Amino acid sequence: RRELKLLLLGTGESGKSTFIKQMRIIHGSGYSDEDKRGFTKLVYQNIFTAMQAMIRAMDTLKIPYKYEHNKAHAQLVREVDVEKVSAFDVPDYAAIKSLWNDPGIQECYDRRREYQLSDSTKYYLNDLDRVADPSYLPTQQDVLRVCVPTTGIIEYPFDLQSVIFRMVDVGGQRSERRKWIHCFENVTSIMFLVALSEYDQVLVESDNENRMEESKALFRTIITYPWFQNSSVILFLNKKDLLEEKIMYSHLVDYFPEYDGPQRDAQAAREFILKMFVDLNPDSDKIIYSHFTCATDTENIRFVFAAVKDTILQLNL
Amino acid sequence: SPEEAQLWSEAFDELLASKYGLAAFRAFLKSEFCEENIEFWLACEDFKKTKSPQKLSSKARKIYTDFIEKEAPKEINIDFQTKTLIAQNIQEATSGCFTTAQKRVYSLMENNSYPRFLESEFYQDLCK
Ligand SMILES: Nc1nc2c(ncn2[C@@H]2O[C@H](COP(=O)(O)OP(=O)(O)O)[C@@H](O)[C@H]2O)c(=O)[nH]1
Ligand code: ALF
Numbered sequence: 001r002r003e004l005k006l007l008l009l010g011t012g013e014s015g016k017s018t019f020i021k022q023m024r025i026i027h028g029s030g031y032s033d034e035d036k037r038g039f040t041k042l043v044y045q046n047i048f049t050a051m052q053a054m055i056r057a058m059d060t061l062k063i064p065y066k067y068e069h070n071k072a073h074a075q076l077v078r079e080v081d082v083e084k085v086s087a088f089d090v091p092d093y094a095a096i097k098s099l100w101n102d103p104g105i106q107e108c109y110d111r112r113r114e115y116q117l118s119d120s121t122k123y124y125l126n127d128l129d130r131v132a133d134p135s136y137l138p139t140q141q142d143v144l145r146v147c148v149p150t151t152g153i154i155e156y157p158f159d160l161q162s163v164i165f166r167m168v169d170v171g172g173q174r175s176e177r178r179k180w181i182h183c184f185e186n187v188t189s190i191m192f193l194v195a196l197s198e199y200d201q202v203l204v205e206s207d208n209e210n211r212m213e214e215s216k217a218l219f220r221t222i223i224t225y226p227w228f229q230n231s232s233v234i235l236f237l238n239k240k241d242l243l244e245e246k247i248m249y250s251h252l253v254d255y256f257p258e259y260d261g262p263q264r265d266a267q268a269a270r271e272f273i274l275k276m277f278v279d280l281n282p283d284s285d286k287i288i289y290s291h292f293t294c295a296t297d298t299e300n301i302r303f304v305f306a307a308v309k310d311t312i313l314q315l316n317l
Numbered sequence: 318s319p320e321e322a323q324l325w326s327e328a329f330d331e332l333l334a335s336k337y338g339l340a341a342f343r344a345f346l347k348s349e350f351c352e353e354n355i356e357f358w359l360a361c362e363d364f365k366k367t368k369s370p371q372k373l374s375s376k377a378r379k380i381y382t383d384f385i386e387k388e389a390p391k392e393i394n395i396d397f398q399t400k401t402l403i404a405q406n407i408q409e410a411t412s413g414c415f416t417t418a419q420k421r422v423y424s425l426m427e428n429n430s431y432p433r434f435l436e437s438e439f440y441q442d443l444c445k
């Protein structure tokens with residue numbers, strides 16, 4: 001029992017619980033054929049919760065539905081309780097089927113930056129047929145895409161060959177940041193995560209406020225904490241595969257006007273992103289490790305964590 | 318007994334139904350500092366059955382300041398949209414003001430805390 005405590009940190013939905021699950025895959029318990037069935041209920045609710053949100057936007061932004069009977073279908077969807085869901089109806093399938101292909105709702109999804117929408121929404125809704133199949137088993141890729149918030153703090157222990165890494169899963173909202181206090185004891189590493197996609201979005205806990213300016217200032221304060229100067233800080237610029245989607249239309253120059261680099265480059269933009277985060281360090285003697293990651297990609301995760309496993313073991317041993 | 322307990326695995330309402338178990342799951346939610354959500358629901362379960370307008374406008378200010386208000390002691394984890402919603406109804410409060418987040422918070426436990434409780438060792442050693 002050689003133990004080292006690690007901390008997974010980041011602003012609301014930078015992809016923390018996704019790592020916890022990824023670690024359970026590569027070096028952990030694994031997700032067998034039976035266990036995948038437990039998720040089913042949520043995957044549904046996620047699509048419901050994914051959809052419900054887009055209906056409120058039709059009220060909010062004032063975008064009109066093209067086919068007027070789609071309003072009655074969305075009205076049926078509005079009144080379905082997200083909690084009590086257990087099996088998937090054909091009508092609710094058709095209700096969801098219909099509205100997704102509605103071009104007004106497709107226009108409502110173009111502007112998902114203007115309100116709250118789980119980014120795994122386009123993942124679930126283009127393969128509805130597979131899901132709405134009564135004998136549907138969720139793949140391993142489907143479980144990663146699930147949108148299940150983490151409230152409070154959690155210890156998920158994993159035993160690697162040479163060492164037992166104790167990871168700390170935590171809640172990434174301002175409301176849950178008061179709790180983080182109870183685990184800062186005995187720390188060897190922080191794994192700070194930042195959603196590369198969330199550069200144009202606004203936070204969940206408030207209005208008219210940019211998420212990366214949240215992630216920047218938050219990151220900044222974690223460093224400054226003096227019980228962490230004898231602990232290795234690792235940055236993780238997550239959701240890089242979404243950044244490639246996002247960068248193509250939304251311009252980073254409309255949000256961080258300093259950027260001298262070129263628009264429409266998934267690389268050139270992210271190489272400036274890491275510079276803003278790594279420009280927030282007071283301590284010159286302390287060094288900042290950084291990896292780019294696609295948290296829902298198990299092969300990309302297995303190379304970053306192996307290179308990081310070697311990074312940490314060389315430090316404290 | 319070890320059967321009353323094994324009955325709770327079935328669904329999340331079976332765990333709420335028993336009295337002993339309601340104190341232990343709290344003792345576990347405490348052990349993951351996410352008890353503010355369980356106490357809130359029972360604040361809503363006692364709120365939903367409240368009758369007189371006097372008790373409806375005063376109890377409504379107890380729970381808000383606790384779980385909702387910005388930098389509230391037991392601030393449950395929820396959005397700004399549901400917090401804006403419940404911020405306009407408290408004046409002339411009614412049984413179905415909070416339910417917006419009550420159901421969110423129940424979902425927050427069924428999909429996160431409760432499953433972990435069934436994998437917990439304190440639960441499983443109770444099941445023999
Ligand atoms: N496309 C993409 N989606 C991701 C990635 N990481 C996480 N997600 C999704 O974003 C959501 C948030 O993940 P989570 O780990 O809960 O972040 P947390 O809220 O900070 O714990 C989940 O629904 C994931 O499916 C990524 O690298 N790429
Ligand atoms: F935003 Al989180 F776990 F940090 F859902």
Ligand SMILES: [Mg+2]
Pocket residue numbers: 016017018148149150170171
């Ligand atoms: Mg999480």
